[PDB]
Amino acid sequence: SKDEYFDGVIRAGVIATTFWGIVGFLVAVIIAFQLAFPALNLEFGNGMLNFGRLRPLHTSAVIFAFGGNALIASAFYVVQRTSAARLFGGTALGWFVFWGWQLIIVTAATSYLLGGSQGKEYAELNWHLDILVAIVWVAYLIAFLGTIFKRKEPHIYVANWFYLSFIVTIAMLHIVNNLAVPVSIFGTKSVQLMAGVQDAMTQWWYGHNAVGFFLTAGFLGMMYYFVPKQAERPVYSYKLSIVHFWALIFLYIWAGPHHLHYTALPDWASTLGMVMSVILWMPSWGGMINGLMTLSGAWDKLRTDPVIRMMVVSIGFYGMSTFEGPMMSIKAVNSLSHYTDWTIGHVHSGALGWNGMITFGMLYFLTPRLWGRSGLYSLKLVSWHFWLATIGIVLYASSMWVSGIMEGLMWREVDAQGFLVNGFADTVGAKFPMNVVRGVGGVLYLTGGLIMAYNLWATVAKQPKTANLAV
Amino acid sequence: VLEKNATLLLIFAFLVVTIGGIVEIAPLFYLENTIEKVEGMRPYTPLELTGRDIYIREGCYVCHSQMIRPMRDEVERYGHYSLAAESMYDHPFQWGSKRTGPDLARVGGRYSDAWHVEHLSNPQSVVPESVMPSYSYLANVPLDSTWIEDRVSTDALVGVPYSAEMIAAATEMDALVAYLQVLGTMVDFS
Amino acid sequence: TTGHSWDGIEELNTPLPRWWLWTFYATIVWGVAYSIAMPAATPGILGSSTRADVEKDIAKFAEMNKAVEDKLVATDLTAIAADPELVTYTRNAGAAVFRTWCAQCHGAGAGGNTGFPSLLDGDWLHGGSIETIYTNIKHGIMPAHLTDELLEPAQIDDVVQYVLKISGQPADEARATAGQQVFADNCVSCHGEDAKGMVEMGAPNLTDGIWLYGGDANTITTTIQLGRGGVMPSWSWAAAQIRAVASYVHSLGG
Ligand code: HEC
Ligand code: HEC
Ligand code: HEC
Ligand code: HEC
Ligand code: HEC
Ligand SMILES: [Cu+2]
């Protein structure tokens, strides 16, 4: 039997997705405030709040915990339905992935503030945690790929192409970038296998591809399932799906050196990164086109359905960032952009605008269904959430652009006499209003997250036994 | 097609995804420019190595870059643009990604130890406008150096030229200052 | 539309958008062009282009502003402070250079703080002359009496009180007699008697007015106990600029 879809894990992951979203974004707001007012840092005593330590916590919680859980819930729900079979690992393998993932985030929460970090971005957790994550991910791929193997229909939905790719590539990236000799039990009590330029390359190959697969590909899978899930029928382009997918999947791995522009990294590598990052523009947009064009005719729905609003706007930000990224990947542009708040602007445009928004919409869609509910408790709240999230994202982006341009310019600016026009401190001071506005925008987005939490909770209350009949 | 075939799709994906990594990462292992240390350079002294770990633990990297780009203005501000050879020993590499604070790569003497102590103790005190967090605990905690030998041994395994003699021979604030003082020094003297 | 449905979802067989195609192809073409043009070429740079552009940037900068610096170098530091052409451009830019390099220790104002000298004022530890200031800048930069058996716990207190009297007048009679005697013995050698101080040593005058230095009895006790040990790092490596800065610092007082 077991004809019914295993909703179990998806339910757990969805709720946790909301929870981690709140935790991660709140850390985001707090650290932002710390940039605005350093007092928020403990003056005497490292303690609980210190920016250097908290920052990676924000990073990991937001990406792996929030984004990660979103990916788990979405992939488990989506693959099951798209292929029409009950999850291959079942409660056992899949639930293991749930608890295991939970353990991973919990360990991050304890470990990071404690000070144990490799110092490698998006890599920060210590080796023991790395082994745990590798194990959980291995289990996760078996469940997912197994689900595909067990499918009913002969064809495999493109959404699964993206999810599947994301799964495999992240595993490879994680293993490779994490090679390190353990000196001690924890924290970064390991030293990376590589050093210098090589370490930088491995790091950014890993680092970009992280957003590339974890944040883009996997989420593209989400978009592929959820955007078309609507009352309106067909409008899409399958051939684009094919071109866009392969081209993206191939091209994206080359993008690593754009991080490294005008650094110690050899010129040839930097160039390869730039060129491929520019080629990357097309496939990435292919995703957005495929998503949006699908809406055509359907647009009237946008006023009606806020979940749709979220998905659509999500693609808007996605395209924007996928455009801005290639531009910043040009050496001349990077010359200005690098080390400035602009990089952050770019990150949150994609993070809040694309990743968060699509996952949000995804959850609003799925959680009622998984919960054995016709719909969310209040649509109005989804709308309010939509607005809060949108203004917050835009405010964040605007502030960062102003700050970033100001910083790059101020840093580079030379006088008539040839001397440096501004002290670094002057640039720092210039940045303050930007820091505050950013703090506010992020705060608003966070509030939207709270509204989501309230709404979801209300809906969650309704029924025990929410097997949703056959499905 | 290959739409239908799970194994084929998986294999092609793994293959497609691999090319960039093989093309970019692998050749670097082989290239000498990125491998060769500056001639003068030696590995971090045990105090400096410990301090570097502290710099890692604290999260200094999150605000401070250690990579000078080859532009005139940054050369003017920071000093000689960073060279691959400088980072040869760095497991893991410290190059920044963000400059909330200024670039640290070449503070090969720029400030006195005393200044560093006061500043780390309370950045606002020395630089009123600073965003930097206060790190007074550094003064509070002493180093046991139990682990230092293990750390150097591991680094040697990794390729760092520590002598047996170096291992045998080997406050946190002291270590951090020691680390900061070495940065970028290797190139200038050599 | 295509025949197979994936739970609700069906997909249209549609063509790639022409513009999308064009942009994709264009990017590819640009990439090939870039690679041929970059490392594998472009004209303008002999050999092969690289980060080598750095040299060009510096070189053109040098051509453009070499004259200004070169003119200044011939001129003496005193002259470079006076003259608003070089001299005034030397204060604003020297002042420009000052902010970037010096401000973090000596204050944006150049007024200084505890542990760092006030460059604006009249008082100079190493000497106010142009040569002295220049030397301070170019080549960069107090004995622990607590230990020297004789000084001890009490001797230090006494000397501190006496110095505060040289600087002004507090009231402590034991802390005065003893201190006078000690100062004449030891301190006076570097700080002189009546604390004129000696510029050669960088020993500051004890007969000063209220400055940023820890005048308090306790602070004086600490400096006497433990001694000083302050550094002015050399700008000869890091820094022409040193000269303009000397001209600026000199201009600062007057
Ligand atoms: C922190 C590391 C400093 C740097 C950066 C700069 N200065 Fe400095 N300077 C510093 C100290 C602690 C002292 C006092 C040293 C002592 O005798 O205890 C000084 C002294 C000077 C002087 C001499 C002043 C005098 O009384 O004769 C000059 C002229 C001076 N400093 C200039 C100067 C310039 C131009 C700087 C930027 C290039 C600069 N200093 C940086 C500490 C520090
Ligand atoms: C984020 C906020 C940080 C944190 C995590 C660190 N620093 Fe910094 N730092 C920051 C700013 C905005 C500034 C400029 C204002 C100031 O000088 O106080 C600095 C400055 C420094 C400097 C001086 C650099 C220079 O002027 O050449 C140093 C040496 C420095 N910071 C060191 C340092 C260390 C060791 C850190 C980890 C404990 C650290 N910083 C963290 C902002 C931030
Ligand atoms: C020989 C060298 C001596 C000796 C024998 C004494 N002093 Fe000190 N002193 C000396 C120098 C070069 C400096 C400057 C230190 C620095 O700038 O880092 C000082 C400084 C002091 C100060 C501090 C002045 C200030 O607050 O800026 C004091 C209070 C002082 N010296 C006192 C002092 C006393 C009481 C001595 C006899 C016990 C004495 N000095 C001897 C150089 C030298
Ligand atoms: C991926 C999802 C994601 C979400 C959602 C997110 N962030 Fe971040 N955040 C990141 C990443 C990635 C970085 C690291 C950027 C870098 O290393 O350049 C970061 C870094 C930051 C920083 C450090 C900035 C700096 O200059 O060092 C702040 C502040 C911040 N985020 C605030 C926020 C706020 C406020 C929110 C409010 C919702 C938020 N974040 C939500 C991903 C996210
Ligand atoms: C989350 C959504 C997201 C999307 C979508 C995205 N990136 Fe980014 N981008 C990031 C993050 C996170 C960083 C910061 C990495 C770091 O910490 O240095 C970044 C930084 C960058 C930088 C600046 C690196 C530096 O330090 O100067 C470039 C260039 C870049 N990305 C290119 C791209 C390209 C090319 C694409 C797609 C074609 C893209 N981005 C899409 C998240 C994203
Ligand atoms: Cu990237």
PDB file of N, CA, C and O in Angstrom, chain A residues 41 43 46 50 53 55 156 161 164 181 183-184 189 192 194 196 198 250 254 260 262-263 335 338-339 411-412 418 420 422, chain B residues 3 10 16 19 24 28-29 57-58 62 65 67 69-70 72-73 77 87 91 93 95 99 122 133-134 147 150-151 154:
ATOM      1  N   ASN A  41      27.309  45.255  20.721  1.00  0.00           N
ATOM      2  CA  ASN A  41      28.405  44.328  20.978  1.00  0.00           C
ATOM      3  C   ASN A  41      28.753  44.423  22.450  1.00  0.00           C
ATOM      4  O   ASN A  41      28.794  45.515  23.023  1.00  0.00           O
ATOM      5  N   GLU A  43      30.935  45.155  25.356  1.00  0.00           N
ATOM      6  CA  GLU A  43      32.177  45.892  25.450  1.00  0.00           C
ATOM      7  C   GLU A  43      33.223  45.113  26.181  1.00  0.00           C
ATOM      8  O   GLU A  43      34.302  44.879  25.634  1.00  0.00           O
ATOM      9  N   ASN A  46      33.534  38.850  25.750  1.00  0.00           N
ATOM     10  CA  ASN A  46      33.165  38.493  24.404  1.00  0.00           C
ATOM     11  C   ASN A  46      31.682  38.242  24.425  1.00  0.00           C
ATOM     12  O   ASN A  46      30.922  38.888  23.704  1.00  0.00           O
ATOM     13  N   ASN A  50      28.770  39.538  19.819  1.00  0.00           N
ATOM     14  CA  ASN A  50      29.951  40.150  19.259  1.00  0.00           C
ATOM     15  C   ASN A  50      29.874  39.904  17.754  1.00  0.00           C
ATOM     16  O   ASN A  50      29.656  38.775  17.290  1.00  0.00           O
ATOM     17  N   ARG A  53      31.778  36.956  15.634  1.00  0.00           N
ATOM     18  CA  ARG A  53      31.235  35.637  15.866  1.00  0.00           C
ATOM     19  C   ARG A  53      29.831  35.435  15.387  1.00  0.00           C
ATOM     20  O   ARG A  53      29.499  34.379  14.849  1.00  0.00           O
ATOM     21  N   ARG A  55      28.221  36.957  13.017  1.00  0.00           N
ATOM     22  CA  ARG A  55      28.022  37.088  11.604  1.00  0.00           C
ATOM     23  C   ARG A  55      27.900  35.741  10.937  1.00  0.00           C
ATOM     24  O   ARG A  55      26.908  35.508  10.246  1.00  0.00           O
ATOM     25  N   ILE A 156      11.008  12.809 -16.168  1.00  0.00           N
ATOM     26  CA  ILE A 156      11.314  13.425 -14.906  1.00  0.00           C
ATOM     27  C   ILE A 156      11.194  14.908 -15.098  1.00  0.00           C
ATOM     28  O   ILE A 156      11.810  15.490 -15.989  1.00  0.00           O
ATOM     29  N   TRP A 161      15.341  18.134 -12.170  1.00  0.00           N
ATOM     30  CA  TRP A 161      16.654  18.245 -12.739  1.00  0.00           C
ATOM     31  C   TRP A 161      17.416  19.185 -11.864  1.00  0.00           C
ATOM     32  O   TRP A 161      18.542  18.907 -11.453  1.00  0.00           O
ATOM     33  N   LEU A 164      17.991  17.735  -8.286  1.00  0.00           N
ATOM     34  CA  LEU A 164      18.929  16.647  -8.323  1.00  0.00           C
ATOM     35  C   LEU A 164      20.308  17.205  -8.490  1.00  0.00           C
ATOM     36  O   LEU A 164      21.229  16.806  -7.777  1.00  0.00           O
ATOM     37  N   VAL A 181      42.950  18.932   7.952  1.00  0.00           N
ATOM     38  CA  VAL A 181      43.499  18.052   8.945  1.00  0.00           C
ATOM     39  C   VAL A 181      43.053  18.525  10.298  1.00  0.00           C
ATOM     40  O   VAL A 181      43.172  19.704  10.628  1.00  0.00           O
ATOM     41  N   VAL A 183      43.320  19.286  14.015  1.00  0.00           N
ATOM     42  CA  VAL A 183      44.318  19.428  15.033  1.00  0.00           C
ATOM     43  C   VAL A 183      43.755  19.010  16.359  1.00  0.00           C
ATOM     44  O   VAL A 183      44.378  18.285  17.135  1.00  0.00           O
ATOM     45  N   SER A 184      42.510  19.459  16.628  1.00  0.00           N
ATOM     46  CA  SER A 184      41.872  19.262  17.896  1.00  0.00           C
ATOM     47  C   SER A 184      40.458  18.891  17.609  1.00  0.00           C
ATOM     48  O   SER A 184      40.067  18.703  16.459  1.00  0.00           O
ATOM     49  N   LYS A 189      39.151  23.409  14.837  1.00  0.00           N
ATOM     50  CA  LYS A 189      40.375  22.915  15.278  1.00  0.00           C
ATOM     51  C   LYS A 189      40.871  22.029  14.210  1.00  0.00           C
ATOM     52  O   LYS A 189      41.305  20.905  14.443  1.00  0.00           O
ATOM     53  N   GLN A 192      42.914  24.029   6.959  1.00  0.00           N
ATOM     54  CA  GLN A 192      42.494  23.661   5.639  1.00  0.00           C
ATOM     55  C   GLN A 192      43.612  23.006   4.902  1.00  0.00           C
ATOM     56  O   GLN A 192      44.787  23.277   5.129  1.00  0.00           O
ATOM     57  N   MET A 194      44.283  23.330   1.819  1.00  0.00           N
ATOM     58  CA  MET A 194      44.950  24.231   0.927  1.00  0.00           C
ATOM     59  C   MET A 194      45.332  25.510   1.606  1.00  0.00           C
ATOM     60  O   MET A 194      45.003  25.746   2.765  1.00  0.00           O
ATOM     61  N   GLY A 196      46.714  29.895   0.659  1.00  0.00           N
ATOM     62  CA  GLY A 196      46.987  30.956  -0.271  1.00  0.00           C
ATOM     63  C   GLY A 196      45.979  31.007  -1.378  1.00  0.00           C
ATOM     64  O   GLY A 196      44.783  30.815  -1.177  1.00  0.00           O
ATOM     65  N   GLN A 198      45.464  29.028  -3.848  1.00  0.00           N
ATOM     66  CA  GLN A 198      44.768  27.799  -4.122  1.00  0.00           C
ATOM     67  C   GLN A 198      43.596  27.690  -3.203  1.00  0.00           C
ATOM     68  O   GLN A 198      42.491  27.348  -3.620  1.00  0.00           O
ATOM     69  N   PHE A 250      26.421  23.888 -16.128  1.00  0.00           N
ATOM     70  CA  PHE A 250      27.788  23.801 -16.587  1.00  0.00           C
ATOM     71  C   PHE A 250      28.594  25.051 -16.323  1.00  0.00           C
ATOM     72  O   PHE A 250      29.708  25.016 -15.802  1.00  0.00           O
ATOM     73  N   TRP A 254      32.247  27.635 -13.236  1.00  0.00           N
ATOM     74  CA  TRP A 254      33.366  28.419 -13.693  1.00  0.00           C
ATOM     75  C   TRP A 254      33.411  29.771 -13.034  1.00  0.00           C
ATOM     76  O   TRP A 254      34.450  30.425 -12.992  1.00  0.00           O
ATOM     77  N   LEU A 260      37.524  36.711  -6.691  1.00  0.00           N
ATOM     78  CA  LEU A 260      38.951  36.897  -6.671  1.00  0.00           C
ATOM     79  C   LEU A 260      39.499  37.977  -7.567  1.00  0.00           C
ATOM     80  O   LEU A 260      40.691  37.925  -7.865  1.00  0.00           O
ATOM     81  N   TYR A 262      41.375  40.915  -9.300  1.00  0.00           N
ATOM     82  CA  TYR A 262      42.472  41.777  -8.956  1.00  0.00           C
ATOM     83  C   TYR A 262      43.081  41.382  -7.649  1.00  0.00           C
ATOM     84  O   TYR A 262      43.524  42.240  -6.884  1.00  0.00           O
ATOM     85  N   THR A 263      43.117  40.070  -7.366  1.00  0.00           N
ATOM     86  CA  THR A 263      43.732  39.548  -6.178  1.00  0.00           C
ATOM     87  C   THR A 263      44.980  38.828  -6.604  1.00  0.00           C
ATOM     88  O   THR A 263      45.426  38.950  -7.741  1.00  0.00           O
ATOM     89  N   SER A 335      36.379  46.174  -9.565  1.00  0.00           N
ATOM     90  CA  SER A 335      37.408  47.019  -9.049  1.00  0.00           C
ATOM     91  C   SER A 335      36.786  47.960  -8.053  1.00  0.00           C
ATOM     92  O   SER A 335      37.410  48.279  -7.042  1.00  0.00           O
ATOM     93  N   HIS A 338      34.210  45.468  -5.070  1.00  0.00           N
ATOM     94  CA  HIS A 338      34.799  44.549  -4.140  1.00  0.00           C
ATOM     95  C   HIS A 338      35.084  45.233  -2.828  1.00  0.00           C
ATOM     96  O   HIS A 338      35.517  46.383  -2.781  1.00  0.00           O
ATOM     97  N   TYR A 339      34.809  44.501  -1.726  1.00  0.00           N
ATOM     98  CA  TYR A 339      35.006  44.847  -0.333  1.00  0.00           C
ATOM     99  C   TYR A 339      34.072  45.921   0.127  1.00  0.00           C
ATOM    100  O   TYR A 339      34.173  46.362   1.273  1.00  0.00           O
ATOM    101  N   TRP A 411      37.140  55.400  -1.379  1.00  0.00           N
ATOM    102  CA  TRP A 411      38.378  54.713  -1.169  1.00  0.00           C
ATOM    103  C   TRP A 411      39.341  55.063  -2.263  1.00  0.00           C
ATOM    104  O   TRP A 411      40.502  55.351  -2.005  1.00  0.00           O
ATOM    105  N   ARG A 412      38.891  55.004  -3.525  1.00  0.00           N
ATOM    106  CA  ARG A 412      39.687  55.265  -4.695  1.00  0.00           C
ATOM    107  C   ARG A 412      39.956  56.723  -4.931  1.00  0.00           C
ATOM    108  O   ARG A 412      40.953  57.078  -5.560  1.00  0.00           O
ATOM    109  N   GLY A 418      47.111  64.445  -6.184  1.00  0.00           N
ATOM    110  CA  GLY A 418      47.419  63.042  -6.351  1.00  0.00           C
ATOM    111  C   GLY A 418      47.215  62.323  -5.052  1.00  0.00           C
ATOM    112  O   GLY A 418      47.209  61.086  -5.018  1.00  0.00           O
ATOM    113  N   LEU A 420      45.310  60.839  -1.651  1.00  0.00           N
ATOM    114  CA  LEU A 420      44.079  60.133  -1.364  1.00  0.00           C
ATOM    115  C   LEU A 420      43.127  61.115  -0.740  1.00  0.00           C
ATOM    116  O   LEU A 420      43.452  61.748   0.261  1.00  0.00           O
ATOM    117  N   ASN A 422      40.054  60.621   0.814  1.00  0.00           N
ATOM    118  CA  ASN A 422      39.361  60.393   2.053  1.00  0.00           C
ATOM    119  C   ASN A 422      40.060  59.376   2.890  1.00  0.00           C
ATOM    120  O   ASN A 422      40.703  58.456   2.390  1.00  0.00           O
TER     121      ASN A 422
ATOM    122  N   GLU B   3      15.765  11.913 -20.486  1.00  0.00           N
ATOM    123  CA  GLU B   3      14.840  12.438 -19.522  1.00  0.00           C
ATOM    124  C   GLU B   3      14.451  11.344 -18.583  1.00  0.00           C
ATOM    125  O   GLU B   3      14.320  11.555 -17.379  1.00  0.00           O
ATOM    126  N   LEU B  10      21.992  11.566 -13.964  1.00  0.00           N
ATOM    127  CA  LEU B  10      22.858  11.772 -12.838  1.00  0.00           C
ATOM    128  C   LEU B  10      24.275  11.868 -13.312  1.00  0.00           C
ATOM    129  O   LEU B  10      25.010  12.772 -12.913  1.00  0.00           O
ATOM    130  N   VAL B  16      28.989  17.305 -16.073  1.00  0.00           N
ATOM    131  CA  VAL B  16      28.832  18.669 -16.503  1.00  0.00           C
ATOM    132  C   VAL B  16      29.341  19.608 -15.454  1.00  0.00           C
ATOM    133  O   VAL B  16      29.965  20.621 -15.760  1.00  0.00           O
ATOM    134  N   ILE B  19      33.648  20.043 -14.791  1.00  0.00           N
ATOM    135  CA  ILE B  19      34.645  20.598 -15.670  1.00  0.00           C
ATOM    136  C   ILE B  19      35.261  21.861 -15.121  1.00  0.00           C
ATOM    137  O   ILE B  19      36.480  22.023 -15.182  1.00  0.00           O
ATOM    138  N   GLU B  24      39.795  24.956 -13.180  1.00  0.00           N
ATOM    139  CA  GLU B  24      40.304  26.036 -12.378  1.00  0.00           C
ATOM    140  C   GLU B  24      41.178  25.645 -11.215  1.00  0.00           C
ATOM    141  O   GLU B  24      42.228  26.248 -10.995  1.00  0.00           O
ATOM    142  N   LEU B  28      46.188  24.896 -10.417  1.00  0.00           N
ATOM    143  CA  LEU B  28      46.768  25.748  -9.418  1.00  0.00           C
ATOM    144  C   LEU B  28      47.687  24.967  -8.540  1.00  0.00           C
ATOM    145  O   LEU B  28      48.667  25.500  -8.026  1.00  0.00           O
ATOM    146  N   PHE B  29      47.386  23.678  -8.308  1.00  0.00           N
ATOM    147  CA  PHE B  29      48.224  22.890  -7.451  1.00  0.00           C
ATOM    148  C   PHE B  29      49.596  22.866  -8.053  1.00  0.00           C
ATOM    149  O   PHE B  29      50.604  22.893  -7.347  1.00  0.00           O
ATOM    150  N   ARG B  57      39.140  32.949  15.323  1.00  0.00           N
ATOM    151  CA  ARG B  57      38.071  32.640  16.235  1.00  0.00           C
ATOM    152  C   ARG B  57      37.161  33.814  16.404  1.00  0.00           C
ATOM    153  O   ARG B  57      35.949  33.646  16.477  1.00  0.00           O
ATOM    154  N   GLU B  58      37.755  34.985  16.611  1.00  0.00           N
ATOM    155  CA  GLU B  58      37.004  36.209  16.854  1.00  0.00           C
ATOM    156  C   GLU B  58      36.097  36.574  15.697  1.00  0.00           C
ATOM    157  O   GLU B  58      34.939  36.949  15.892  1.00  0.00           O
ATOM    158  N   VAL B  62      35.721  38.945   9.089  1.00  0.00           N
ATOM    159  CA  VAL B  62      34.420  39.468   8.713  1.00  0.00           C
ATOM    160  C   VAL B  62      34.353  40.966   8.517  1.00  0.00           C
ATOM    161  O   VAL B  62      33.359  41.484   7.983  1.00  0.00           O
ATOM    162  N   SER B  65      39.943  42.709   5.380  1.00  0.00           N
ATOM    163  CA  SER B  65      40.537  42.059   4.248  1.00  0.00           C
ATOM    164  C   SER B  65      42.020  41.961   4.449  1.00  0.00           C
ATOM    165  O   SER B  65      42.614  42.750   5.182  1.00  0.00           O
ATOM    166  N   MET B  67      44.176  41.506   1.567  1.00  0.00           N
ATOM    167  CA  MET B  67      44.536  41.364   0.165  1.00  0.00           C
ATOM    168  C   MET B  67      44.533  42.735  -0.477  1.00  0.00           C
ATOM    169  O   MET B  67      43.484  43.365  -0.606  1.00  0.00           O
ATOM    170  N   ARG B  69      44.762  45.059  -3.601  1.00  0.00           N
ATOM    171  CA  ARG B  69      44.566  44.995  -5.024  1.00  0.00           C
ATOM    172  C   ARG B  69      45.545  45.933  -5.667  1.00  0.00           C
ATOM    173  O   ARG B  69      45.967  46.946  -5.117  1.00  0.00           O
ATOM    174  N   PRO B  70      45.847  45.597  -6.877  1.00  0.00           N
ATOM    175  CA  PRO B  70      46.836  46.268  -7.682  1.00  0.00           C
ATOM    176  C   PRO B  70      46.453  47.626  -8.206  1.00  0.00           C
ATOM    177  O   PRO B  70      46.820  47.920  -9.340  1.00  0.00           O
ATOM    178  N   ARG B  72      46.353  51.945  -7.864  1.00  0.00           N
ATOM    179  CA  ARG B  72      47.201  52.986  -7.351  1.00  0.00           C
ATOM    180  C   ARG B  72      46.682  53.475  -6.033  1.00  0.00           C
ATOM    181  O   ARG B  72      47.447  53.672  -5.093  1.00  0.00           O
ATOM    182  N   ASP B  73      45.357  53.688  -5.919  1.00  0.00           N
ATOM    183  CA  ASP B  73      44.878  54.237  -4.686  1.00  0.00           C
ATOM    184  C   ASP B  73      45.034  53.247  -3.573  1.00  0.00           C
ATOM    185  O   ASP B  73      45.332  53.646  -2.448  1.00  0.00           O
ATOM    186  N   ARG B  77      47.064  53.683  -0.203  1.00  0.00           N
ATOM    187  CA  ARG B  77      46.530  53.557   1.126  1.00  0.00           C
ATOM    188  C   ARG B  77      47.194  52.487   1.946  1.00  0.00           C
ATOM    189  O   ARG B  77      47.550  52.721   3.099  1.00  0.00           O
ATOM    190  N   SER B  87      50.749  34.498   0.937  1.00  0.00           N
ATOM    191  CA  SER B  87      49.727  33.654   1.509  1.00  0.00           C
ATOM    192  C   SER B  87      50.023  32.171   1.430  1.00  0.00           C
ATOM    193  O   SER B  87      49.175  31.356   1.789  1.00  0.00           O
ATOM    194  N   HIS B  91      46.868  28.490   6.113  1.00  0.00           N
ATOM    195  CA  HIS B  91      45.816  27.517   6.157  1.00  0.00           C
ATOM    196  C   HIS B  91      44.913  27.934   7.277  1.00  0.00           C
ATOM    197  O   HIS B  91      45.322  27.842   8.438  1.00  0.00           O
ATOM    198  N   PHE B  93      43.289  30.518   4.048  1.00  0.00           N
ATOM    199  CA  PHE B  93      43.616  31.857   3.625  1.00  0.00           C
ATOM    200  C   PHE B  93      42.640  32.840   4.217  1.00  0.00           C
ATOM    201  O   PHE B  93      41.450  32.572   4.381  1.00  0.00           O
ATOM    202  N   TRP B  95      42.408  36.147   3.045  1.00  0.00           N
ATOM    203  CA  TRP B  95      42.021  37.228   2.167  1.00  0.00           C
ATOM    204  C   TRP B  95      40.626  37.606   2.545  1.00  0.00           C
ATOM    205  O   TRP B  95      39.841  36.759   2.959  1.00  0.00           O
ATOM    206  N   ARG B  99      35.418  44.950   3.627  1.00  0.00           N
ATOM    207  CA  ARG B  99      36.242  45.862   4.373  1.00  0.00           C
ATOM    208  C   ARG B  99      35.360  46.792   5.158  1.00  0.00           C
ATOM    209  O   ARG B  99      35.168  47.947   4.780  1.00  0.00           O
ATOM    210  N   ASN B 122      39.489  48.701  23.260  1.00  0.00           N
ATOM    211  CA  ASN B 122      38.308  49.483  23.001  1.00  0.00           C
ATOM    212  C   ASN B 122      38.615  50.336  21.802  1.00  0.00           C
ATOM    213  O   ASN B 122      39.301  51.350  21.919  1.00  0.00           O
ATOM    214  N   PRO B 133      34.093  46.157  17.276  1.00  0.00           N
ATOM    215  CA  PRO B 133      33.723  45.693  18.597  1.00  0.00           C
ATOM    216  C   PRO B 133      34.889  45.721  19.532  1.00  0.00           C
ATOM    217  O   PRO B 133      36.035  45.702  19.082  1.00  0.00           O
ATOM    218  N   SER B 134      34.604  45.796  20.841  1.00  0.00           N
ATOM    219  CA  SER B 134      35.599  45.835  21.864  1.00  0.00           C
ATOM    220  C   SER B 134      35.950  44.407  22.226  1.00  0.00           C
ATOM    221  O   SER B 134      35.096  43.534  22.359  1.00  0.00           O
ATOM    222  N   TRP B 147      48.514  23.016  22.725  1.00  0.00           N
ATOM    223  CA  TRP B 147      48.108  22.652  21.393  1.00  0.00           C
ATOM    224  C   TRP B 147      49.059  23.117  20.318  1.00  0.00           C
ATOM    225  O   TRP B 147      49.083  22.548  19.227  1.00  0.00           O
ATOM    226  N   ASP B 150      50.939  20.683  18.365  1.00  0.00           N
ATOM    227  CA  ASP B 150      50.148  19.872  17.482  1.00  0.00           C
ATOM    228  C   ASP B 150      49.847  20.659  16.250  1.00  0.00           C
ATOM    229  O   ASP B 150      49.903  20.142  15.136  1.00  0.00           O
ATOM    230  N   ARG B 151      49.532  21.951  16.429  1.00  0.00           N
ATOM    231  CA  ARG B 151      49.139  22.773  15.327  1.00  0.00           C
ATOM    232  C   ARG B 151      50.266  22.883  14.352  1.00  0.00           C
ATOM    233  O   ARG B 151      50.072  22.740  13.146  1.00  0.00           O
ATOM    234  N   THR B 154      50.769  19.748  12.419  1.00  0.00           N
ATOM    235  CA  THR B 154      49.802  19.521  11.386  1.00  0.00           C
ATOM    236  C   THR B 154      50.135  20.366  10.189  1.00  0.00           C
ATOM    237  O   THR B 154      50.047  19.907   9.052  1.00  0.00           O
TER     238      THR B 154
END
